[model samples]
Target: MENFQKVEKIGEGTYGVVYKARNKLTGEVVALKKIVPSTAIREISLLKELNHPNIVKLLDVIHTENKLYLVFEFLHQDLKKFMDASALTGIPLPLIKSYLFQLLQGLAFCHSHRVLHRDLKPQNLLINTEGAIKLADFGLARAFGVPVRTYTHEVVTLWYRAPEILLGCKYYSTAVDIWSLGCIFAEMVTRRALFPGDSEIDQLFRIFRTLGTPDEVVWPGVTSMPDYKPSFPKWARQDFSKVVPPLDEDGRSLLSQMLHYDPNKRISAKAALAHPFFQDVTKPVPHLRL
Candidate 1:
């Protein structure tokens, strides 16, 4: 850890505080995530497995007698900060397409290896001066492919959590990530979170109001969830026009597909990458150099 000098505290995370540091040897800047022993091993294992241009790079890991330190590629800001400073009232269509495409691309890589990023939010996405979006913070991420092992449903941020998880469904799949992507997509267009619910029940209602409530017909076994209970009096089918009024037809269509009630029915990242919304608004290999 002595090889890098801590410059300033950048943010407080669930595991530890992140600092802006300078490498003593090269004098280059980097982000240092100082982890307490309890939170170090899992994150280190997860990060070492993830390598993608659109995902924060783990440059090096330094272990000391007292704690573990993570060395990462530094960035000017995160998506939340970038959104705050940008001039546009809403993200430009082309830029949204670029970000979403990159997000899905990174997710595709993660899902291919059976790794689930339990937490997906704008704050965890780092954006360099180049406009590239990188997914960060794997503290809650877990590799899931075993045959029905009990795990915590207490994963993912509230706004980005999936419906099944919200309903207290014990068994889940990689489709949970697709749901989070849908939430992020809506946030990018509106410049605000889509479902900001006060509680679990409230969150379900918010999602139901816009995307329609899922019933046994649409989402079988929904009633079998451990925490399942009827909330809304009526179930309405999805009306994308009302949910994303600012988006074009293609954009709304893609959103609907990704936010589908049935996890099985939800569009995969690879499929989403081919959506017409990207074709209309994005260029291939969009430059993101800082």
Candidate 2:
């Protein structure tokens, strides 16, 4: 603790409180997440093995008798605040493409490692001053390879939660994060949530309203979910152009796949990187696209 000076609290969760701090020796800014026993070790164990430009880096770990501090490279802001500010100023197309690509790139790395970021949202996506976006907040994340395990559907935030998960589907995959990222990708362009549902039921309805109600023909194993509901009013998939008026044809096409209700059919993070929407953008590090 003496090696770093605490600047102020940044955010909190069920397991911990994160603070902005600076190393006393090197004067380097870092995020110090003060967490308890269970959540502390899980996040640390996962971050220790994962490294990518799109994911937040775990710099160091400090432990005490009753405390565990997870250190990370400091970021300028989260996407929520960045979106709020973007709403005020006019948005540019290249900037939007960059963040979306980097998000997919980071997700590609996580999925390749067989990890599931169960809780992905604008609040967890940090944006550096350079406009580079990196995925953060791993308290709810877990590895998903090897033997399959049943996970609770109450994992993701309401607005961004996938329909399959909301319907109490215990078994999930990396596609869960893609659903969350899809919502964030739409929000990045519109500067507002595509589905701002207040509850799980409402969230599904909102998704269905935009993407249409799913049936056995669409979501093959939807009705088999633990808490499946057949009462949801059926709806036809709405036009993507109206929802994202400013987006180009390539962008809309990619958005449609990302927002698929079927996890198996949902766009993979690696495939998303190859979408035509990012081809014309000048992005190596999110410069033009970066």
The estimated TM-scores of all candidates read 0.85, 0.87
**Candidate 1 lDDT over residue span 1-290, tens digit each:** 78898899888655557899999999999999875344545656656767988878888877788676778888877777766655356567788888888999988987887767776878788876566888887434442221222223233347888989888886778788889888888888877788988778888888887767778888888777877777554757656776777889888889888988889999998899888888765633322323
Per-residue lDDT of candidate 2, residues 116-175 (tens digit): 778788888887766688888653445221112222212335787887778888778889
Clashing pairs in 2: 282-289, 286-289, 286-290, 287-290
State in Å the error of residue 74, model 1.
Answer: 1.0
Error of 2 at 269 (Å): 1.1
Give the local distance difference test score of model 1. Answer: 0.76
Clashes of each: 0, 4
Q: For model 2, state the Cα shift of residue 112 in Å.
A: 0.6
Poorest stretch of ten by lDDT in candidate 1: 144-153
**Model 1 spans with C-alpha error above 4 angstroms:** 36-43, 143-156, 231-235, 281-290
Best prediction by lDDT? 2
